[PDB]
Design a protein around this motif. Structure first.
Motif, mmCIF file in Angstrom:
data_model
loop_
_atom_site.group_PDB
_atom_site.id
_atom_site.type_symbol
_atom_site.label_atom_id
_atom_site.label_comp_id
_atom_site.label_asym_id
_atom_site.label_seq_id
_atom_site.Cartn_x
_atom_site.Cartn_y
_atom_site.Cartn_z
ATOM 1 N N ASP A 43 0.815 -1.205 0.000
ATOM 2 C CA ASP A 43 0.000 0.000 0.000
ATOM 3 C C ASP A 43 0.856 1.267 0.000
ATOM 4 O OD1 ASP A 43 -3.046 -1.022 0.451
ATOM 5 O OD2 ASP A 43 -1.668 -2.242 1.649
ATOM 6 N N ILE A 90 1.759 2.938 -3.094
ATOM 7 C CA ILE A 90 0.686 3.689 -3.738
ATOM 8 C C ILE A 90 0.265 4.933 -2.953
ATOM 9 C CG2 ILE A 90 -1.698 3.634 -4.463
ATOM 10 C CD1 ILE A 90 -1.442 0.753 -5.125
ATOM 11 N N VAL A 91 -0.321 4.697 -1.786
ATOM 12 C CA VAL A 91 -0.926 5.724 -0.958
ATOM 13 C C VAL A 91 0.151 6.482 -0.183
ATOM 14 C CG1 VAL A 91 -1.223 4.243 1.036
ATOM 15 C CG2 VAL A 91 -2.775 6.130 0.691
ATOM 16 N N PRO A 98 3.173 8.419 -0.835
ATOM 17 C CA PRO A 98 3.526 9.828 -1.031
ATOM 18 C C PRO A 98 2.388 10.765 -0.654
ATOM 19 C CG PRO A 98 3.453 8.580 -3.112
ATOM 20 C CD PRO A 98 3.538 7.602 -2.000
ATOM 21 N N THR A 99 1.154 10.324 -0.867
ATOM 22 C CA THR A 99 -0.012 11.083 -0.438
ATOM 23 C C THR A 99 -0.085 11.220 1.077
ATOM 24 O OG1 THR A 99 -1.237 10.080 -2.239
ATOM 25 C CG2 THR A 99 -2.471 11.196 -0.497
#
Lengths: 99, 49, 50, 49, 49
Positions: D37, D40-41, D43-44
């Motif tokens: 995860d 994907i998630v 850097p956000t």
């Protein structure tokens, strides 16, 4: 509470620790369904070679395969009549949902 | 109010000649993650290896 | 004003043509269901923010 | 016949988020979940920490 | 006498490491068959089963 955790993925360390603390202090039952595991069945003389702290069960990556161990303590012989009393209490947290 | 369940082709067709497998393959596939075509190629290349 | 002109100019001359870059194709089971619903097979390794 | 285009792989946008953190409540230490995860998630999550 | 448990496992001697199978746990496990693309597959991944 009989809490069900279908997916741990977003859960904070704070919340997981609080859930475990509720399992212990408020006597919660928490079924974690995200977990997949192999399960060696130990016999009492061989003990538990591998250990899993509550943190790691609550934070292990999804899709990784845990390797839990479970005692078959049926082959534990009776204690001596003169063995000193146990003032304490052996405890257990982890259980299977299926045979 | 319904009941989803696998129904083998053999329970439909009376001609054994064109029926090679059973429900078991469907179940085994249900175990597999959905695969991108490159993952399929990777599986095949691996088995080939 | 000069800055807006240069922005506009740099856009007017943005002749970039994307080629697919490095792109992960994660195993489905490894993702939290909330990410799996969003993800469409592969994604660029350089995911931005959102 | 022409050098019309500039091929590039991981395009950058014209806009972008810029974030000011209140240092008293921020932890400078990087957050992360499972690698799958985080890829994907991640850097956000760190940006809007 | 004294046998605590008697299990029925896949024969490790037959489903050898030459097939790529590992059987040290309860289940067959094969590395690098069903994998993510663009990243190394995680160790002890469940898909191995």
């Amino acid at each position: 509470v009989h809490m069900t955790i279908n997916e741990r993925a977003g859960m904070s360390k704070l919340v997981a620790d609080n859930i475990i603390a509720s399992v212990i202090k408020s006597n919660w039952v928490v079924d974690i369904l995200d977990i997949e595991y192999t399960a060696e069945v130990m016999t009492p003389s061989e003990g538990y070679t591998q250990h899993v702290d509550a943190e790691s069960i609550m934070t292990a990556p999804k899709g990784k395969l845990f390797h839990l161990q479970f005692m078959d303590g049926l082959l534990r012989p009776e204690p001596s009549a003169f063995d000193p009393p146990a003032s304490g209490e052996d405890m257990r947290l982890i259980y299977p949902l299926q045979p | 109010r319904y009941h989803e369940s696998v129904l083998e082709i053999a329970d439909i067709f009376d001609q054994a000649d064109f029926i090679q497998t059973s429900d078991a393959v469907r179940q085994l596939r249900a175990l597999m993650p959905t695969l991108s075509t490159s993952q399929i190629r990777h599986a095949i290349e691996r088995i080939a290896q | 004003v000069s800055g807006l002109l240069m922005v506009l100019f740099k856009v007017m001359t943005d002749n970039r043509l994307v080629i697919v870059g490095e792109t992960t194709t994660p195993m489905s089971n490894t993702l939290s269901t909330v990410v799996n619903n969003v993800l469409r097979t592969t994604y660029h390794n350089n995911v931005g923010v959102n | 016949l022409s050098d019309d285009f500039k091929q590039i792989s991981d395009p950058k946008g014209y806009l972008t988020y810029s974030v000011k953190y209140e240092d008293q409540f921020t932890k400078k230490d990087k957050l992360r979940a499972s690698e799958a995860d985080d890829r994907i998630v991640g850097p956000t999550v760190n940006l809007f920490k | 006498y004294g046998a605590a448990v008697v299990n029925i496992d896949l024969n490790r001697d037959f489903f050898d490491t030459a097939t790529g199978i590992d059987l040290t746990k309860g289940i067959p496990l094969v590395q690098d068959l069903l994998v993510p693309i663009g990243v190394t597959a995680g160790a002890e991944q469940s898909a191995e089963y």
